[PDB]
Subunit: 238 residues, 4 copies
């Protein structure tokens, strides 16, 4: 049996147990600021990610066991103009050596918009901009090896309000669940889908966040994570 967990109720600057990639900083107020902010305003064509430093053991090929995990986080997206919000934020699992990919609507996760098993990405996206591959309206998606989501639901962005997310994986039913709640307006969202982690991901992964502002100057938003817990449990064989 192997477990990993961590809790950040706020972030400290220069976090040596986080791998910050692209534009990501920790602010002095303790937020994980994924996309760049200049003179109080979001900057376009910005891409940031943040990963927990230690690899997570999510499945074992010797014993053929798969881990459960649950993560929670709070985030804020602030678009100066809501109709021109872009591009979004995602929580993801990826190979240990993962590096930022294309900015914009590919969210730093993929180098193109195709399906490809060699990506080894599972992600939950909070997608604020309609690209050619997206359904109509802002949405939450479960993504496996592609920016084109396996399943989506409608989600109305509440601008500059705190969103509380929980994402969990139940290995016995191969089910990934993702929920978002806005306590300020009592609005909530949920979806789940079958995802087989053993087929998709390597035995060890890194986990974290990615976000991207839009590729034109008028399509911008901030993406701040305020807090983050993670728990995984790789059980004994059964």
């Amino acid at each position: 049996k192997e477990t990993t967990s961590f809790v950040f109720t706020r972030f400290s600057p220069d976090p040596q147990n986080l791998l910050l990639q692209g534009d990501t900083v920790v602010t002095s107020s303790g937020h994980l600021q994924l996309t760049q902010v200049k003179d109080g305003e979001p900057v376009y064509s910005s891409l940031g990610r943040a990963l927990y430093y230690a690899p997570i053991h999510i499945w074992d090929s010797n014993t053929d066991t798969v881990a459960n995990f649950v993560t929670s986080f709070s985030f804020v997206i602030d678009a100066p103009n809501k109709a021109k919000a872009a591009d979004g934020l995602a929580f993801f699992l990826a190979p240990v050596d993962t590096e930022p990919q294309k900015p914009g609507g590919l969210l730093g996760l993929f180098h193109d918009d195709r399906h490809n098993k060699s990506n080894h990405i599972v992600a939950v996206e909070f997608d604020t901009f309609k690209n050619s591959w997206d359904p109509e309206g802002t949405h939450i998606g479960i993504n496996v090896n592609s920016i084109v989501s396996r399943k989506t639901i409608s989600w109305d962005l509440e601008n500059d309000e705190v969103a509380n997310v929980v994402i969990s994986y139940q290995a016995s039913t191969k089910t990934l669940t993702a929920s978002l709640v806005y306590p300020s307006s009592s609005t909530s969202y949920i979806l789940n889908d079958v995802v087989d982690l053993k087929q998709i991901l390597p035995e060890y992964v890194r986990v974290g966040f990615t976000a991207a502002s839009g590729l034109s100057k008028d399509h911008v938003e901030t993406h701040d994570v305020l807090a983050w817990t993670f728990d995984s449990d790789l059980p004994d064989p059964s």
Copy 2:
């Protein structure tokens, strides 16, 4: 700081740390069987509840702090005839000396269908039968001092399938959230509402389940809880 927690991944017979009320038994397969089953079939006019034996400290009048809590459970409802399903199951918080009330659509929680502050009940209901006070269709509700829910959502009962529920209370936003997922069909439901526990409940409560089969012989279903975790945290002041 005060915390309480417990986990049952299955139930043992004669559980001395559970207060079983009404018809409740533990089966040999380790399920908490809330309504009576005779010759493989559910019995009508059955009422059962089950509560954790220790009172939970959910708020402190000395320090004026309120607890957070999160509970998870799995349940199954099996109606021999789905169109004649009744009456439902609920998770609730109530005063320590709580006793079963009226059977049927009052779910063992209330002695009538009125709003009354002296009930001191907060509950999440999984309501399989439309009474005069209910909205159309089977539904999930948040209930405060009344069988008439403060807020509801549509919920399609998946007969004899395992439902995974999580209910949580965030004291800083006074928000109660309830989710239900069916991993078998990848279907999921969520709602949340403002509930002020300090106004509604006494400082110590008991927590648990209640269920009721219908009051006519043809309107019946089973109500089994398979597993239950509970966690509460009453923080230090300020």
Copy 3:
């Protein structure tokens, strides 16, 4: 799998999830005051206990599995005259319906000084007074069904200083371990012994504290518990 846990970093007055027995009160400073205090001084012939309200499932006769547990607590003993300190404090496990027994050197645990399997008591004692059955000097003991300890070590009472205790049970080796640390003086104590909980205790027990002041007016001390955590885990069968 069944787990129970709780944490009190301090105690609130009228604690409804604790069974207070004998003289026990909660002070305004949030201490669990086991033996009586009058005009700033300890009172003789005083006996107090305190138990967590919910029974603990420590072993299951169906599956023949036994729980692990760990408990921690901080206590203070203040003897006005150290040479006349009596009688002591103990942490114990006992049947659910347990009631206080004889005061004095029997510590509220036993009705006599003999060995008897029908007691169903396992205890760790912090013994400040030499009775006929005791070794020389103040000591810590592991006690099974008798005030005459199965094993003891020397322990020097540090008067009015905070003692941090941890007691744990490892079921696979049948080993009970007890440690005491005084952080003020950097002094520490440990012992362990084989105890088979399945032979000694019923399936469900209550856990908590007992203490007794001496049976003459000049042989007195206070016994205050400042904080208490408990964790038990009854695993799935092998």
Copy 4:
């Protein structure tokens, strides 16, 4: 608030969340084998270490808080000849970039036997061989910036038996406590001392194990870790 934790009830081969240094391997039976073994006999002049991959945030200079932590582990030392046992095992905290130092009685921790504040090492040692700086007999020591322990106790090595260790740090009293229990013989050991982590260590550290076999062919032993849990909690400011 920041917490880190992990649990290994056994080890898997090629553990990507452990930084293995020197001779360390994971066996097929799931042991962390710190010093080299050639066909079930220990090899001399062997040095191995193992660290959790993620840095631990043990204190924060912004908020002036210091973390508590607790770690537990099980180890086995098997000396073919007990009288010629060498050199030992240690649990330690060190700067993130820490590298193995001198083999033998310096245990892979230090490059010499002097006191030096630029080491930034806190360690608990299980020392099986008497060097010039050591007290008489095999012993457990608390070490701050030097192989010459700040405090020691006598410890009798029980050859090829499982030792259960717990080490904890209480920030409010600046107290480091270390215990060892042999459940097989019911023997146990404990010590504690004042250590101010803020003065000694950087804000982020790595934690783990080191071990060394002796520098002559007849002074050898194995050093296997069977299991390891770690928990740290860097609290919010008052």
